[PDB]
Amino acid sequence: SKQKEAIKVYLELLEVHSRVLKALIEQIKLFIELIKRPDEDLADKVRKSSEELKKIIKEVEKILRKVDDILYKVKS
Amino acid sequence: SSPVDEIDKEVKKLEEEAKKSQEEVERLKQEVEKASKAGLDHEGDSRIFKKIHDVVTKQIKVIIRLIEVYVRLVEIIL
Amino acid sequence: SSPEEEKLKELLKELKKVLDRLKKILERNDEEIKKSDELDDESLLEDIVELLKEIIKLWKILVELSDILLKLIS
């Protein structure tokens, strides 16, 4: 059923948002130390965490496309 | 006292809320899996989705508070 | 006020705009689901679509905000 389909989407979002929390907390801590003291190794792992967030964006765009596929078939 | 140290304090508090959120998510995933393996009514699927919706909403609100703290961090150095 | 600082303040005001409308979406979705009993499948996915769109815009601003902050802090 389509209500079970919206359940699968939300479960996917929980797993995604957990990695958003983990990535966002790391970036804030890294900036706290960068503001107190600049360090290139710290700046590098900020760029690494930013790239991880970019891949998460792509995962959320894939979730959205799959939901739009269902909505398009429902409204058809 | 110090503004950056106040933000450091607030992030540690929000980090603990993230840990508690993840713990609640794991309890939900176990209940959903138990509900998936059982023949549920359309009302049973309703209460399950409402349960999942509340956990999703709580988790996003933790993210928003993190971002609002993040914003305060940016405004300090500006 | 400098060019890069103005770019950050513009993105920061856009971030506040996105957060505000995101909280309105969470409230509307929570309000619509609290009607209990049977839930429509179309409106449920449409509410999800609107949530995902703002969530995607949110992360995109955070990614760009992180880049500008690294330029400022050097």
Residue numbers in the entry:
A (entry chain C): 0 to 75
B (entry chain B): -1 to 76
C (entry chain A): -1 to 72
Authors' own words:
We designed helical heterotrimers with specificity conferred by buried hydrogen bond networks and large aromatic residues to enhance shape complementary packing. Crystal structures of a helical bundle heterotrimer and extended versions, with helical repeat proteins fused to individual subunits, showed all three chains assembling in the designed orientation. We succeeded in determining three high-resolution structures for DHT03: the original base construct, a one-arm version (1arm_A21/B/C) and an elongated two-arm version (2arm_A21/B21/C long). We show that computational design can create cooperative ABC heterotrimers that can assemble as free-standing helical units or as hubs in larger designed assemblies.
The first crystal structure was determined to 2.35 Å resolution. The design model (shown in darker colors) has an overall 2 Å Cα root mean square deviation (RMSD) agreement to the crystal structure (shown in lighter colors) with the largest deviations upon individual chain superposition in chain C. Many of the hydrogen bonds in the design model are not present in the crystal structure, but the overall placement of these residues is relatively close in space to the design model and the ABC heterotrimer still assembles with buried polar groups in the core (water molecules were not detected in Fo–Fc maps, but we cannot entirely rule them out as the overall completeness of the dataset was ~75%). The placement of these residues also appears to be effective in specifying orientation as the chain C orientation in the design model matches that of the crystal structure. There are two possible explanations for the deviations in the hydrogen bonding between the crystal structure and design model. The first is that optimization of nonpolar packing in the actual structure distorts the protein slightly so that many of the designed hydrogen bonds do not form. In support of this, the crystal structure has lower Rosetta-computed energy than the design model due to improvements in sidechain rotamer preferences, Lennard–Jones/van der Waals interactions and solvation energies. The second possibility is that, in solution or neighboring low-energy states, small backbone adjustments allow for more or all of the designed hydrogen bonds to form (Rosetta may not accurately capture the energetic cost of buried unsatisfied hydrogen bonds). On the one hand, the crystal structure of DHT03 shows that many of the designed hydrogen bond network residues are not making hydrogen bonds due to small local distortions in the structure. Instead, they appear to be buried without making any hydrogen bonds, which is expected to be extremely destabilizing.
